[PDB]
Swiss-Prot record:
Subcellular location(s) of the protein: Cytoplasm; Nucleus; Nucleus, Nucleolus; Endoplasmic reticulum
Residue ranges constituting the DRBM domain according to the UniProt record: 8-75
Protein name: Double-stranded RNA-binding protein Staufen homolog 2
Organism of this sequence: Mus musculus
Domain of life: Eukaryota
Length: 89
């Protein structure tokens, strides 16, 4: 697996390994929503932290999971805020 290019999964896995803790534990919450693009609920367990990911497909739901996990951790917060606003302080 591990979709080419930088992804939320790998990025997370790389953190789990770089942290010397243990790879992330993904758990499928559920799967519901529109028929065309059903909404899949994904879960991610990292150490003593947990996150969720929702997308049009389980896959994405997983990618979105790590994303949140990375954000919740504070690995994509800087950018986030930056995007939301500059606020040079």
């Amino acid at each position: 697996g591990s979709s080419g290019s930088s992804g939320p999964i790998s990025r997370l896995a790389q953190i789990q390994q770089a942290r010397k803790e243990k790879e992330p534990d993904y758990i499928l919450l559920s799967e519901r929503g529109m028929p065309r693009r059903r909404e899949f609920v994904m879960q991610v367990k990292v150490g003593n932290e947990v996150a969720t990911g929702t997308g049009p497909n389980k896959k994405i739901a997983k990618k979105n999971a790590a994303e949140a996990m990375l954000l919740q951790l504070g690995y994509k917060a800087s950018t986030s805020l930056q995007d939301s606003g500059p606020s040079s302080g």
